[PDB]
Design a protein around this ligand. Sequence first.
Ligand code: HEM
Ligand SMILES: *c1c(C)c(O)cc(C(C)C)c1O
Ligand SMILES: CC(C)C1=CC(=O)C(C)C=C1O
Ligand SMILES: CC(C)C1=CC(=O)C(C)C=C1O
Ligand SMILES: CC(C)C1=CC(=O)[C@H](C)C=C1O
Length: 137
Amino acid sequence: GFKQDIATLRGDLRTYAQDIFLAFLNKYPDEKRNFKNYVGKSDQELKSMAKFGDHTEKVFNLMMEVADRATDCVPLASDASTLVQMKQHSGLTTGNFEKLFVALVEYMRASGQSFDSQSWDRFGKNLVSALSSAGMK
Ligand code: HEM
Ligand SMILES: *c1c(C)c(O)cc(C(C)C)c1O
Ligand SMILES: CC(C)C1=CC(=O)C(C)C=C1O
Ligand SMILES: CC(C)C1=CC(=O)C(C)C=C1O
Ligand SMILES: CC(C)C1=CC(=O)[C@H](C)C=C1O
């Protein structure tokens, strides 16, 4: 279920973070508008870039904490507030987050693995709801 999937992802977090973030960037090419340093690079070149890995990992380190602190895939309002009020998220809207979670769920469905993809889908919807509530447009 959801709590085991957090354990699974954390067990190889750099790998999973980069693979899911590349699945998001490739599924939604316009989303490389929030990322000028990634333009004109292949996946292998992005994995070579220290920024790419350090940053993607820090995104998933936080996402897994927000997942871990959730009850029944419902994130804490305090974690939504943190995500809306981060200076790095100033230009963002809930659609940015929705797309990341669609990619994440798709990746999980496509994997050979017993991820609880329905729970991730619901968590992403609940996060987007909480971000909206917290004041994201
Ligand atoms: C649950 C989902 C997400 C979490 C937990 C999260 C968390 C974070 C964290 C921790 C950072 C700082 C990393 C660093 O400076 O090394 C960051 C930066 C960033 N995040 Fe988010 N984020 C999420 C979703 C997104 C989405 C959906 C977008 C855009 C589609 C986005 C765009 C950014 C940008 C543009 C930066 C800074 C630019 C850069 O230097 O790469 N994030 N995020
Ligand atoms: C997430 C979890 C962890 C849970 O127990 C239930 C749901 C759905 C089935 C309401 C989640 O998305
Ligand atoms: C990043 C942005 C300029 C952009 C938008 C897109 O629609 C596509 C296919 C490709 C892109 O590069
Ligand atoms: C997801 C990944 C590439 C990522 C890395 C980052 O370092 C920042 C600042 C923001 C991100 O979204
Ligand atoms: C406890 C039970 C009803 C339940 C919990 C879940 O987490 C999932 C994905 C599916 C379920 O039906």
